[PDB]
Amino acid sequence: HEMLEGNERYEGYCVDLAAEIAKHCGFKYKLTIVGDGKYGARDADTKIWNGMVGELVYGKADIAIAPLTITLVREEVIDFSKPFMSLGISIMIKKPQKSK
Amino acid sequence: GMVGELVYGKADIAIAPLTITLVREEVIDFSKPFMSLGISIMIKKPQKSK
Amino acid sequence: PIESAEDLSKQTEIAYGTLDSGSTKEFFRRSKIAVFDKMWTYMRSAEPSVFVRTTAEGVARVRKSKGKYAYLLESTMNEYIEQRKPCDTMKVGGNLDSKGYGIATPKGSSLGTPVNLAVLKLSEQGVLDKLKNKWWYDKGECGAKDSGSKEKTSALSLSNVAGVFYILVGGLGLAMLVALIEFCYK
Amino acid sequence: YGIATPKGSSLGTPVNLAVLKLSEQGVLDKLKNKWWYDKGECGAKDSGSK
Amino acid sequence: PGVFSFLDPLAYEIWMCIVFAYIGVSVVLFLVSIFNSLWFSLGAFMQQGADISPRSLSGRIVGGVWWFFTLIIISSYTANLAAFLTVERMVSPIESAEDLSKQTEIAYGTLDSGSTKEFFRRSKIAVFDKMWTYMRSAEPSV
Amino acid sequence: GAFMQQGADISPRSLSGRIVGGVWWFFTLIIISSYTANLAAFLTVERMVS
Predict the structure, then answer these.
(1) Could you give the dihedral angle defined by the CA atoms of residues B27, B31, B35 and B41, in that order, rounded to the nearest 10 degrees?
(2) Which residue of A has its CA nearest to B36?
(3) What count of Cα atoms within 13 Å lies in the side-chain half-sphere of residue E109?
(4) Strand-pair partners of A69
(5) H or E segment at E36?
(6) Is residue E33 a contact partner of residue C177, using CB atoms and an 8 Å limit?
(7) Integer-rounded Cα radius of gyration of chain C
(8) DSSP strand E in C18-130: where?
(9) Are E62 and C172 in contact (CB under 8 A)?
(10) Which of C81, C159, E44, F17 is least surrounded by Cβ atoms within 10 Å, i.e. has the fewest?
């Protein structure tokens, strides 16, 4: 990454998804990382939005392509698109082996 | 069908097992999903023992 | 060794916990379902604290327990760690609740409606099912199932044979006790 | 699956938000289990097939 | 090849324990009945285990458990020795080209640029596609 | 008659003959074990020719 510059610095699922969304919509996009590194939440006392959901409302970004969990508290301030990957709570145990 | 009765005014809302596809999202508004699913396998109960 | 999720809440040898704050912990709190309510009541008063500070701690706690601790989390992160070295984690059973990620736009934005349609065209063209299959299984560090066919483990242990030595010396301990009660009668 | 409403309807935004409140309150997972496992007929073929 | 290929199905540690149980049981048969009784217990290990008790009995139950002990170890060695040989038959000595892309122990790569690497790139066949997708993201650079 | 039943009596036991067969028993105990193992793999999957 210290030899590249721009979107090519990063790579991953949402990185490849950012291109596919831009291709099927036609717009030049610039991948930027969220300031605070957090997801979408609202403070208890200040009640200010933080993270990616905050940058959308306060006009600091244009769109969010990330593992953003579709919750009702966020659907009120921003618009969630249709889901692109269904998931749910599962169990992580100790695989073999064990060999016990 | 049901999507027809929505577009053509003969209904107000569709609460039914309606698959969310692109061709339907262009003519009617889908709400957020209430039940995720997918294609799976149905095998007969393994006839153990025998 | 564990199939479904209701099974792991029926025992206490393998303690289980979630993250100390997040969408996972709050689910068990406000769960009106029978099985999930019993799970929260156990973790709410489990000592030592089954809750972990960060999600990275939850995975390290399953790998160090020799199979005596299980961490509950998203099916994405669990299926992902399963395809990472040392290939010691494994998703089991179905998912607890139904949730999903989504692309977010500001309300009343020009991007809102077109992007939403764009996700469906990718999902139906198999693009989303292919990128998913790309960044967790294709670029993964473990088989699965490709490891069940390349089983190159033909070892032999001493711990298995130790039981026949126990019943032998235990039989010799009963033999010497019978030996001592046979030299006295005659 | 999802609930469908005609485009530009006054039910669109309210009913969409409603599905999330039902899913996060567990009412959807409850109603799902109600007409699937509770009122099911194979109480001995689901807990023994594991 | 070599002589070892004998402690391969049976761990080094268990070879020392069965010899300890050999002298651990031969010394119990000495007290129920110095050179003639150890010579008998070697003639007893030779045949299952443990006579001259005469009959009755202390001795009968010394080797009666030793027999069940020595009957088990020889059954465990036979089973594990069958496993180390069956895996060699089940692996398939590599034979065709698609067999190379089915395992990851024997890695594979091509040239960094040429008609060989370009062939796996634009290939529309199923078998060659998996090889490129593997070698494209295989670390280190195959 | 000693090869018939494992190995070597009329020493009896004491002793030299008892160690002739005592090693011959362990010798004939490993060989018969090696026969059953290799013959098992011979009945599992066979090519069985070029």
Answers:
(1) 20
(2) A86
(3) 11
(4) C101
(5) helix E35-45
(6) no
(7) 26
(8) 69-74, 89-92, 99-106
(9) yes
(10) C159
Q: What's the token pair of residue C99?
A: 């949730």
Chains A and D touch (3+ CB pairs under 8 A): yes
**B19 assigned binding-site residue:** yes
- The single residue listed with the structure tokens 């095998």 is B43
Kindly tell me the sign of the dihedral angle through the C-alpha atoms of D27, D28, D29, D31.
positive
Domains of chain A in start order, with CATH, are: 1-94 (3.40.190.10)
Q: What distances in angstroms separate CA B19 from CA B15, B22, C181, E100, F46, one per listed residue?
A: 11, 10, 82, 42, 51
- Polymer length of chain C: 186
DSSP label of C66: T
Would you call A12 helix, strand, or coil by DSSP?
A: coil
> First-to-last CA distance in chain D?
27
**Method in brief:** X-ray
Q: What span, in angstroms and rounded, lies between the C-alpha atoms of C49 and C51?
A: 5
CB pairs under 8 A between B and C: 16
Neighbors of chain E with 3 or more C-beta pairs under 8 Å: C, F
Distance from CA of B50 to the nearest CA of D (A): 17
Contact E92, C157 (CB under 8 A): no
Tally Cβ neighbours within 10 Å of residue C161: 20
Q: Helix, strand or coil for residue C91?
A: strand
Q: What angle, 0 to 180 degrees and rounded to 10, lies between the N-to-C axes of helices F16-41 and E58-90?
A: 40
Distance separating alpha carbons of residues D3 and B29, to the nearest angstrom: 8
Q: Three-class SS of residue C110?
A: coil
- Is the separation of the CB atoms in A68 and C102 below 8 Å? yes
State the SS3 of B6-41: HHCCCCCCECCCCCCCHHHHCCEEECCCCCCCCCCC
| Euclidean distance between CA atoms E29 and E51, whole angstroms | 8
Token representation of residue E27:
């010394």
Strands A89-94 and C15-17 come out as unpaired
d(CA C59, CA A67): 19
Q: Which residue has the tokens 């005596």?
A: C68
What type of residue sits at position C95?
N
| Tokens 């929260």 found at | C40
E50: left (phi over 0), alpha (psi -120 to 50) or beta: left
CB pair distance less than 8 Å for C4 and D50? yes
Could you give the count of Cα atoms lying within 13 Å of C5 in the half-sphere of its Cβ?
Answer: 21
Q: What would the two tokens of residue C8 be?
A: 């792991």
Q: Which two tokens stand for residue D37?
A: 């496992």
